[PDB]
Coordinates of C-alpha atoms and ligand atoms in Angstrom, one line a residue:
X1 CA 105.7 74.6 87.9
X2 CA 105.4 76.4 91.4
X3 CA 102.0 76.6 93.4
X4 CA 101.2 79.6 95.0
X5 CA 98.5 79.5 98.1
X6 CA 95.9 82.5 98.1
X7 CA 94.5 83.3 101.9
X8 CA 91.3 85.1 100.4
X9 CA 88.9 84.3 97.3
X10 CA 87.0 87.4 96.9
X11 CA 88.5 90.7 94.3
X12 CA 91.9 90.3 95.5
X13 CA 91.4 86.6 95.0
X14 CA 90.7 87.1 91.9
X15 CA 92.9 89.1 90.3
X16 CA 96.3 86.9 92.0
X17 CA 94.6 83.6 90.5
X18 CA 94.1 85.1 87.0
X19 CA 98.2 86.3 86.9
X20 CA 99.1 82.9 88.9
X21 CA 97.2 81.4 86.4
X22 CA 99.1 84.0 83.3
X23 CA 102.3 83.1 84.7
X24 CA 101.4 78.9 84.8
X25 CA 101.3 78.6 88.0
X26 CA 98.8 76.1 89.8
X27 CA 96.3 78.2 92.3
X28 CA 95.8 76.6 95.9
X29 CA 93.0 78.8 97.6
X30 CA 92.2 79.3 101.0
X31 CA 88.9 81.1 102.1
X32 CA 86.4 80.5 105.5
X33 CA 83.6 81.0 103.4
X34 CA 82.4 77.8 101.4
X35 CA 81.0 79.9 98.9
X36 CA 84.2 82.1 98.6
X37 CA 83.7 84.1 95.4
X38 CA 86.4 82.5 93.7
X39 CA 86.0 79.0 94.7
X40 CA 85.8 77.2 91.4
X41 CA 88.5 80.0 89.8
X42 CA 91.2 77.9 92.0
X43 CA 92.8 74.7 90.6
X44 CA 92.5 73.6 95.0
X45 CA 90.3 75.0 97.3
X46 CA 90.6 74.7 100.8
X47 CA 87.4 76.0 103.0
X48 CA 88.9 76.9 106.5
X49 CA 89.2 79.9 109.0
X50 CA 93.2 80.2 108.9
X51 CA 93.2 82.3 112.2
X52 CA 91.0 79.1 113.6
X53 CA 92.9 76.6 112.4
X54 CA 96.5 77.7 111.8
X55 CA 97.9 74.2 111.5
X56 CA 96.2 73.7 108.4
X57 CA 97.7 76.7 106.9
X58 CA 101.7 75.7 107.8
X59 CA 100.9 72.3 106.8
X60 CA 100.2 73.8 102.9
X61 CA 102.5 76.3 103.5
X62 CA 105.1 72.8 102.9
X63 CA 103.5 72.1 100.3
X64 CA 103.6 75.9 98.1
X65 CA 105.7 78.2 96.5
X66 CA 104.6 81.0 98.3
X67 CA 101.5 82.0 100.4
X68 CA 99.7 85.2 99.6
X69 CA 96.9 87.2 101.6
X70 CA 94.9 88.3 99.8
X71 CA 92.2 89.8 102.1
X72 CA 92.0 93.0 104.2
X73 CA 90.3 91.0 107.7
X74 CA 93.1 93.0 109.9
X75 CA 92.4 90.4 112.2
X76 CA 93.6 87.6 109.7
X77 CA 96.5 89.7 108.7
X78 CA 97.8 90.7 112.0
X79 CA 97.4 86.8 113.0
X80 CA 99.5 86.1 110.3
X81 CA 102.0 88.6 111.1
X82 CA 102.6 86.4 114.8
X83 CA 103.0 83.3 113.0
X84 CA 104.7 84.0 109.6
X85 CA 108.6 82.5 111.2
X86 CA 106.8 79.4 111.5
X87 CA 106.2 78.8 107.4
X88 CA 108.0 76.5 105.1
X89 CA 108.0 79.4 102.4
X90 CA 107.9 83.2 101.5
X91 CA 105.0 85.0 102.7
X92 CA 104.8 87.7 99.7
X93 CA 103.4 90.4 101.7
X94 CA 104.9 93.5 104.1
X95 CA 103.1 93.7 107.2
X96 CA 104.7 96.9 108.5
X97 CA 103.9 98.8 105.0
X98 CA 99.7 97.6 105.6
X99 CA 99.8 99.0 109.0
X100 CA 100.6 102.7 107.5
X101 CA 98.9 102.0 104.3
X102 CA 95.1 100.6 105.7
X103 CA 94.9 103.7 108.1
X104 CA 94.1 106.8 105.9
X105 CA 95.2 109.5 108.1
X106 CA 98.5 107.2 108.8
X107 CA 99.5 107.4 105.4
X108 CA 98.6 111.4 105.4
X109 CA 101.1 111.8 108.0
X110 CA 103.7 109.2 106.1
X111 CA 102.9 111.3 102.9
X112 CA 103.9 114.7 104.6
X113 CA 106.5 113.1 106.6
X114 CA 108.6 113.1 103.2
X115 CA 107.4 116.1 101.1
X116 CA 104.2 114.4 99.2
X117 CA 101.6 116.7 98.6
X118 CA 98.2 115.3 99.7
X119 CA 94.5 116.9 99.8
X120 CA 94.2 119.3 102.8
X121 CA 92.5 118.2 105.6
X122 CA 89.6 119.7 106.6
X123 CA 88.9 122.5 104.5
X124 CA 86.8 125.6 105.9
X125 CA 84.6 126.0 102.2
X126 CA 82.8 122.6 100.0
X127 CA 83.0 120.5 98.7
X128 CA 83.8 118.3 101.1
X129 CA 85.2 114.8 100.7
X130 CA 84.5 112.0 103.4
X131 CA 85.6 109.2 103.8
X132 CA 86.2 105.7 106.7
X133 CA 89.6 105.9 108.0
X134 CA 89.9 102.2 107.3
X135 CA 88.0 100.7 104.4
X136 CA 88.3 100.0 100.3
X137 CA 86.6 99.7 97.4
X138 CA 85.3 103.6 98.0
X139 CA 83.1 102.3 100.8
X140 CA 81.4 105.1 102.6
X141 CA 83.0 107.5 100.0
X142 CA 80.9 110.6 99.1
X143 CA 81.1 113.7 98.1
X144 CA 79.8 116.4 100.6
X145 CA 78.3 120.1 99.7
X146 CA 77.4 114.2 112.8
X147 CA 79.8 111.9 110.8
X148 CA 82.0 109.6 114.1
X149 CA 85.0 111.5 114.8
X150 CA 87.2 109.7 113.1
X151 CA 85.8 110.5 109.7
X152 CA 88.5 111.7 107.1
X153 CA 87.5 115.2 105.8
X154 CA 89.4 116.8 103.0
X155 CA 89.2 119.1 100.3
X156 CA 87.4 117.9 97.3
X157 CA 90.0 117.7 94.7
X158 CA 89.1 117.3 91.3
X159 CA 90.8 115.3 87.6
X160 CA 92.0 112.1 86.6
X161 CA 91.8 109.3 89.5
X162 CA 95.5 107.4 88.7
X163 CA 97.3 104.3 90.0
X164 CA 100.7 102.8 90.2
X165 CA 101.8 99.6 91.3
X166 CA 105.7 99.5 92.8
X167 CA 106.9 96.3 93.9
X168 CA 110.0 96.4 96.3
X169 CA 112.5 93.6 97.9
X170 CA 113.6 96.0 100.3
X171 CA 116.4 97.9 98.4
X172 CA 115.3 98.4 94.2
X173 CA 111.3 99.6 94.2
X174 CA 110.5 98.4 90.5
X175 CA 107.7 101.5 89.5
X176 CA 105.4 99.2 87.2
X177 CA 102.5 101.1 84.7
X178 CA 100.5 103.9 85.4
X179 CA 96.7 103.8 84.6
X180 CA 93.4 105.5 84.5
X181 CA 91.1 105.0 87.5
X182 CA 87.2 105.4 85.6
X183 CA 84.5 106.2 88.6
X184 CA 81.7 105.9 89.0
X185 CA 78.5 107.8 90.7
X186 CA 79.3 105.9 93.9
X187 CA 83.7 106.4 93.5
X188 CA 83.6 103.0 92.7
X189 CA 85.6 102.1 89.9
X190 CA 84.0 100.2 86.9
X191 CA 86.8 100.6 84.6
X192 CA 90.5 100.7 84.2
X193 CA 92.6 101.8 80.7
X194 CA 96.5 102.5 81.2
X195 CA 98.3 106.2 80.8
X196 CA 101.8 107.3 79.6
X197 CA 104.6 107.6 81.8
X198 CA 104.4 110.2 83.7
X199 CA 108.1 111.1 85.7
X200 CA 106.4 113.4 89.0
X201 CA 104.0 109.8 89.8
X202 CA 106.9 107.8 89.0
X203 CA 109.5 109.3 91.5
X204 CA 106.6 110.0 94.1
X205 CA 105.5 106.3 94.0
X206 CA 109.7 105.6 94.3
X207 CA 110.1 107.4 97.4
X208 CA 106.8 106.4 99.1
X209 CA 108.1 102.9 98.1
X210 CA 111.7 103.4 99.2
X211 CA 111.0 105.2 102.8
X212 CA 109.0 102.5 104.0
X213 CA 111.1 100.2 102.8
X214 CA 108.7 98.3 100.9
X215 CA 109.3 94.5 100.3
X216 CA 106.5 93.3 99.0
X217 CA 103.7 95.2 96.6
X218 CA 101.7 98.4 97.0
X219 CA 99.4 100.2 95.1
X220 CA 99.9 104.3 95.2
X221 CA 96.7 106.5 94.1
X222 CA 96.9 110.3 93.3
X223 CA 94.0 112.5 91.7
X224 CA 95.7 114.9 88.7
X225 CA 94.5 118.1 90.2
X226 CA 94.0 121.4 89.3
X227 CA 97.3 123.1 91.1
X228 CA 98.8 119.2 90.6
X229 CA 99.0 116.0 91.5
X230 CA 98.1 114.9 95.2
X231 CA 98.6 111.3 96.9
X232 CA 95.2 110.1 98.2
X233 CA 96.1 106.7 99.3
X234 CA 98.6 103.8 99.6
X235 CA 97.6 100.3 99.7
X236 CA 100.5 97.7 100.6
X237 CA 98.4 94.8 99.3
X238 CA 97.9 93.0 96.2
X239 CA 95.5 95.1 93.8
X240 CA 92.7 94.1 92.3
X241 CA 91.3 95.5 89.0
X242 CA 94.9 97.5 87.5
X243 CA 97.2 94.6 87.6
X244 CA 95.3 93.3 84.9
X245 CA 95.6 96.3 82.8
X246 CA 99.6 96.0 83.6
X247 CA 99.9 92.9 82.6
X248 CA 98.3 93.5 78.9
X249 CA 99.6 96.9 78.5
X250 CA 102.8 96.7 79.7
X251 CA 103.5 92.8 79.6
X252 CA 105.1 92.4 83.3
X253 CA 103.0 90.1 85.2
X254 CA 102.8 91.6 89.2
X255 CA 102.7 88.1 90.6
X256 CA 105.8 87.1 88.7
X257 CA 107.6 90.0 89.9
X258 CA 106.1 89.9 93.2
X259 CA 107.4 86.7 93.5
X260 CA 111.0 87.5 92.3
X261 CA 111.0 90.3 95.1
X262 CA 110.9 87.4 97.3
X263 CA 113.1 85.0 95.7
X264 CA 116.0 86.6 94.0
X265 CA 115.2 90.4 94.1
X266 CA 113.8 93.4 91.8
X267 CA 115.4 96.0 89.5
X268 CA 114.5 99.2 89.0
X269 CA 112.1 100.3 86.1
X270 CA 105.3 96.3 75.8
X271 CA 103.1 99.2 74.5
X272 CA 100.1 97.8 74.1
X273 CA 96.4 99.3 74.7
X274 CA 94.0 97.6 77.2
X275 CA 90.3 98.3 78.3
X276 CA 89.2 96.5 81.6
X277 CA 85.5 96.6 83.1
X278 CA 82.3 95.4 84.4
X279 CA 79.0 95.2 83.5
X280 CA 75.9 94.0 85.0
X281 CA 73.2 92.6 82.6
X282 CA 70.5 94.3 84.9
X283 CA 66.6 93.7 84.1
X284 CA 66.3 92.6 80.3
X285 CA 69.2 92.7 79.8
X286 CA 70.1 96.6 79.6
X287 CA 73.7 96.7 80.4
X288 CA 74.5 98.8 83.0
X289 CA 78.2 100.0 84.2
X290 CA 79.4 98.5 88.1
X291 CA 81.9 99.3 90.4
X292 CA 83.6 96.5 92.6
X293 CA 81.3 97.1 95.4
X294 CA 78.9 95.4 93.4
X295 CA 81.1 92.5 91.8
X296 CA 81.9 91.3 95.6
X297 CA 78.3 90.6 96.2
X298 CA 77.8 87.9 93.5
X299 CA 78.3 84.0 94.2
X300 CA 80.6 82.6 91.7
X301 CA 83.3 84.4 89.7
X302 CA 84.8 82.4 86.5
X303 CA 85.6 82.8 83.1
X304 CA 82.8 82.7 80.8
X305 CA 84.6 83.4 76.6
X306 CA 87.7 84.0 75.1
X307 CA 89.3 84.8 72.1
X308 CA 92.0 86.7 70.7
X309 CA 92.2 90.1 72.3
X310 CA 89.1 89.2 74.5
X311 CA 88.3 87.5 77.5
X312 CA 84.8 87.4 79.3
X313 CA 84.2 86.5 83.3
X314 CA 81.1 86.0 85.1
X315 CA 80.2 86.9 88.2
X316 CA 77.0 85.3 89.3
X317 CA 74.5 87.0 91.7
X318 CA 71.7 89.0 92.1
X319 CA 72.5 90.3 88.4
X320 CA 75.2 88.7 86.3
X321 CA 78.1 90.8 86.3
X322 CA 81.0 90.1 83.2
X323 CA 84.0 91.7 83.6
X324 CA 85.8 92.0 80.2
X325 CA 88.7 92.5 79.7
X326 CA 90.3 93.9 76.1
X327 CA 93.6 94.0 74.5
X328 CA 94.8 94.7 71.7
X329 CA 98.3 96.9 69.7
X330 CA 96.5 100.8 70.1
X331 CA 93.1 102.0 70.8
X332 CA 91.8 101.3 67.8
X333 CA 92.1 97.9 67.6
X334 CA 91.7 97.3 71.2
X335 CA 88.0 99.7 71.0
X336 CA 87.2 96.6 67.8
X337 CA 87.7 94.3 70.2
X338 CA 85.1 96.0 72.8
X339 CA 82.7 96.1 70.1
X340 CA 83.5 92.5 69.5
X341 CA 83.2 91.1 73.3
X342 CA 79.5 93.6 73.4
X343 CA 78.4 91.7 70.8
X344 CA 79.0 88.3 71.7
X345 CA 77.2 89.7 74.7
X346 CA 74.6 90.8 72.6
X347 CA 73.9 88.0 69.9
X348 CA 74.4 85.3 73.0
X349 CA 72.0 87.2 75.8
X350 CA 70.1 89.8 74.4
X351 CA 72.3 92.4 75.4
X352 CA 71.6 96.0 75.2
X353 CA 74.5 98.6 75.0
Ligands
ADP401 N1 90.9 84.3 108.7 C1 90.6 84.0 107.4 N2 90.7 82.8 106.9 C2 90.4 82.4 105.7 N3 89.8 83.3 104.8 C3 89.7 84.6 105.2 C4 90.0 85.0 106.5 N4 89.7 86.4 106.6 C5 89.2 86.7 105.4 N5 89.2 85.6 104.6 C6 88.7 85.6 103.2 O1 89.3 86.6 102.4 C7 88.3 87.1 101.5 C8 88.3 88.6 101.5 O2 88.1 89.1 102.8 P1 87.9 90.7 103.1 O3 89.2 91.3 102.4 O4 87.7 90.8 104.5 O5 86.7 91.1 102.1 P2 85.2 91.5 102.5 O6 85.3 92.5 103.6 O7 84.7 92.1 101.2 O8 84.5 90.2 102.9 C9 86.9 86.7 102.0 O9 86.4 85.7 101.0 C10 87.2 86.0 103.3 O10 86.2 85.0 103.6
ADP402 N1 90.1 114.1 98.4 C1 89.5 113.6 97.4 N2 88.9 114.3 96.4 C2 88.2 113.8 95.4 N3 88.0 112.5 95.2 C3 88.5 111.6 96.1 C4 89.3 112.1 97.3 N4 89.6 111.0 98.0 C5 89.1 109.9 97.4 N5 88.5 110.3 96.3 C6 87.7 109.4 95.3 O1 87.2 108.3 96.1 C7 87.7 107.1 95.7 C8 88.1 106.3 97.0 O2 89.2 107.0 97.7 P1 90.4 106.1 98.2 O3 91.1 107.2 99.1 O4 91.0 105.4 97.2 O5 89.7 105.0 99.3 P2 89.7 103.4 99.0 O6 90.7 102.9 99.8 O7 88.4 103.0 99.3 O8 90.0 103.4 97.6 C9 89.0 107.5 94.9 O9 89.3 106.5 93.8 C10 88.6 108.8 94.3 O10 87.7 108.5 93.2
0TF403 N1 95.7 99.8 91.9 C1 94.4 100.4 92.0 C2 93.5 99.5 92.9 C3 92.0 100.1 93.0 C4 91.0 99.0 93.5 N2 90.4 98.4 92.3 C5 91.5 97.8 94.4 O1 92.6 97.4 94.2 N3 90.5 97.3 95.2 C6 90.7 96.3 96.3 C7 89.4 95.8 96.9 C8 89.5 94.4 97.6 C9 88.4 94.2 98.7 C10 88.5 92.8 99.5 N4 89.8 92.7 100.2 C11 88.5 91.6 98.5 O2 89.5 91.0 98.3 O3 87.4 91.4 97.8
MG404 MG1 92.1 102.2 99.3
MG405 MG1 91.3 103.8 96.6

């Protein structure tokens, strides 16, 4: 059995201690915050600022598999980056990759530096697009029709919002599962359902993985445009949110081969159907589509049911928020299975949908 210590209990958190957990691992969580999100998700939790008290962290990091951040504080990663010769195992992550891939208009450049075609930046007609240089989640996100200087402003480009994971060791970039990115209203993203194979993605998300080089895991997001496909953004950081989709609809398990990448190294390259989203039971219980922004806000994040082809979390807040999560062999019987998880939802709370 191997242990694997998480540095961040929120999204991220989340999503490395439900494959940890997939792949039998026990979950050792550190987070600053005593009421971290994930707090009670972990098998361990250890409530400590690791940039504060770094001792702490190499002490565990004796005691672990592997440590993985999980969190976007630059200021926690870049501390880590200064200590990580002094850990007693892996760190599964690629610091140099996160320094292109957090900075929007780094990654533009890195995207054009090898031939990846990106949205324009700032068009002369609208819509615009805006967006931070910096943030996630589609924070500060909007569509436009005295922002600070440093604003990114590109053509608007419209389609299908798609993701693929590539996890490298260096030399073979293993391109995992594409899927569907559902937004909403805000560009947050209350769903995810996986998509075919698609070759152009594929060989794009290879050769932004292989001209870093990527050792670690990164996240590559393109919009299916009008006059074709166009890179919007790299993250070099465990997702949240898709890897669980992977894992169903493709069977390989990102932490596993995360790990691997680390341990003995990756090789390059299921068929099942998978529906993953949240839902807030807002005032009497209408249920009512979120994005992430609104998941991260809650208090406690656990599971709630499961049964074959479901499984139910809770994120308790200001509104419950579920995220459910479906499987099943095609559509059909995965959409029975969404019916299913509504209506234990709806016999159990007084659910409306
Ligand atoms: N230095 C740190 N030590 C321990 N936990 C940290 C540190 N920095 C961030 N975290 C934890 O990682 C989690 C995610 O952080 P972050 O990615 O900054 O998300 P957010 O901006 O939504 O709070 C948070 O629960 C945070 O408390
Ligand atoms: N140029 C664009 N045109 C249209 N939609 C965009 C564009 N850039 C981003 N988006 C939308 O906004 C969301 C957030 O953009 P992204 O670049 O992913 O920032 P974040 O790092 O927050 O995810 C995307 O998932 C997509 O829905
Ligand atoms: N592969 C597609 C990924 C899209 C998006 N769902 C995502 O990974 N979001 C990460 C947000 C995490 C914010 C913060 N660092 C936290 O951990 O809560
Ligand atoms: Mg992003
Ligand atoms: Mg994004």
């Amino acid at each position: 059995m191997k242990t694997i210590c998480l540095v961040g209990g929120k999204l991220q958190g989340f999503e490395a201690a439900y494959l940890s957990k997939k792949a039998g691992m026990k979950v050792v969580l550190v987070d600053k915050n005593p009421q971290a999100l994930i707090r009670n998700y972990a098998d361990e939790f250890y409530c400590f600022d690791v940039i504060k008290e770094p001792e702490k962290l190499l002490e565990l990091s004796k005691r672990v598999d592997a440590v993985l951040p999980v969190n976007e504080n630059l200021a926690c990663i870049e501390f880590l980056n200064s200590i990580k010769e002094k850990f007693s195992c892996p760190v599964l992550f690629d610091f140099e990759a996160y320094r292109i891939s957090r900075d929007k208009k780094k990654s533009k450049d890195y995207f054009k530096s090898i031939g990846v075609p990106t949205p324009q930046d700032r068009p002369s007609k609208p819509p615009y697009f805006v967006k931070p240089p910096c943030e996630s989640s589609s924070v500060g996100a909007r569509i436009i029709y005295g922002l600070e200087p440093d604003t990114l402003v590109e053509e608007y480009v419209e389609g299908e919002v798609v993701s693929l994971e590539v996890v490298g060791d260096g030399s073979h970039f293993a391109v995992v599962k594409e899927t569907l990115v559902h937004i909403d209203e805000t560009y947050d993203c209350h769903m995810v359902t996986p998509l075919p194979a698609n070759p152009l993605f594929r060989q794009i998300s290879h050769d932004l993985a292989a001209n870093l080089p990527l050792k670690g895991i990164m996240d590559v997001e393109a919009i299916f445009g009008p006059k074709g496909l166009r890179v919007i953004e790299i993250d070099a950081r465990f997702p949240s949110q898709t890897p669980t989709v992977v894992y169903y609809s493709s069977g390989i398990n990102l932490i596993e081969l995360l790990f691997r990448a680390f341990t003995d190294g990756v090789e390059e390259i299921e068929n099942k159907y998978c529906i993953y989203e949240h839902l807030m039971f807002g005032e009497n219980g209408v249920l009512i589509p979120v994005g992430e922004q609104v998941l991260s806000m809650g208090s406690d994040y656990g599971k709630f049911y499961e049964e074959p082809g479901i499984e139910i979390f809770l994120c308790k807040g200001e509104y419950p928020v579920f995220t459910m999560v479906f499987w099943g062999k095609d559509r059909e019987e995965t959409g029975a299975k969404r019916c299913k998880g509504l209506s234990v939802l709806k016999e159990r709370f007084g659910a409306v949908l």
